[PDB]
Amino acid sequence: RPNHTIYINNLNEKIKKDELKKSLHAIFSRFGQILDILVSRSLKMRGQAFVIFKEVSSATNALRSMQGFPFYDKPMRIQYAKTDSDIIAK
RNA sequence: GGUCACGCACAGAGCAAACCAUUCGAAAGAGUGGGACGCAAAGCCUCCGGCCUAAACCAUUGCACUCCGGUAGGUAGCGGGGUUAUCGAUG
Ligand SMILES: Nc1ncnc2c1ncn2[C@@H]1O[C@@H]2COP(=O)(O)O[C@H]3[C@@H](O)[C@H](n4cnc5c(N)ncnc54)O[C@@H]3COP(=O)(O)O[C@H]2[C@H]1O
Ligand SMILES: [Mg+2]
């Protein structure tokens, strides 16, 4: 089940691309190094993000401590990405 | 002269990117001034593609990695197309 990348939905959709990333970056650094934060505001990708960590444990630490963490008036829903991000698959 | 098409010229004339001041806008970006990178339509119009922005309304609780909802805007100096225009070495 666990993977380097964590899936995050129930995010506020009204947030910009620049802001959203900067805000997630500031939050999840507590758990390890983030290689890149994948945020797009396309129809299917609104209110969700992907955070890719250095080690898998970093994602686990993040996932277990931030579940339902009220971020921008909304408690986050965090789960592991079911498929490895294209950066890791390389 | 009128006209179909075209740009290797020749005669004029014109337009003005960047950057800056300044206003309008949530933004993309536009107006007005100063500026000239360049433009044969860099006059004009969003009808066809694309790109950009997304404040509001609407839809959306969605596993993406090329981007990509409806609608709203922008860009004609991204292309197509429509339209009007200076010169004729040109077909
Ligand atoms: N439709 C036309 N009517 C009359 N003459 C034409 C023409 N198309 C081309 N030419 C002639 O050929 C020259 C080169 O044209 P080009 O388009 O390659 O290169 C041109 C063009 O790209 C640009 N340019 C100049 N004036 C322009 C304008 N009024 N509108 C658009 N672009 C212009 O600067 C270049 C040099 O200008 P320049 O007049 O000295 O030189 C031009 C012009 O004399
Ligand atoms: Mg001349």
Side-chain angles (χ1 to χ4, degrees):
Chain A
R1 196 171 300 276
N3 168 45
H4 284 108
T5 307
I6 45 152
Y7 170 85
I8 310 154
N9 56 322
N10 193 68
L11 295 174
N12 193 336
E13 283 144 33
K14 295 251 200 171
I15 325 303
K16 297 208 165 195
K17 231 170 211 170
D18 310 346
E19 209 162 345
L20 193 39
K21 289 197 191 193
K22 185 184 73 185
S23 304
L24 292 153
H25 198 94
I27 280 177
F28 294 99
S29 70
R30 202 178 86 206
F31 313 105
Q33 275 215 303
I34 309 157
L35 325 174
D36 201 16
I37 311 149
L38 280 283
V39 170
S40 60
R41 295 177 67 183
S42 63
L43 177 67
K44 297 285 178 167
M45 286 316 292
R46 314 191 97 91
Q48 45 191 14
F50 292 102
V51 175
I52 316 169
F53 278 107
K54 202 191 185 194
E55 38 265 301
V56 199
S57 60
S58 291
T60 304
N61 298 308
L63 177 141
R64 295 204 174 206
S65 298
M66 306 268 85
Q67 180 65 219
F69 183 77
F71 164 72
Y72 283 22
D73 201 17
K74 285 176 83 173
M76 303 182 287
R77 185 163 295 280
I78 296 165
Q79 50 198 262
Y80 298 108
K82 68 193 187 198
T83 323
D84 306 335
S85 279
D86 221 308
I87 299 157
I88 323 153
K90 207 164 280 189

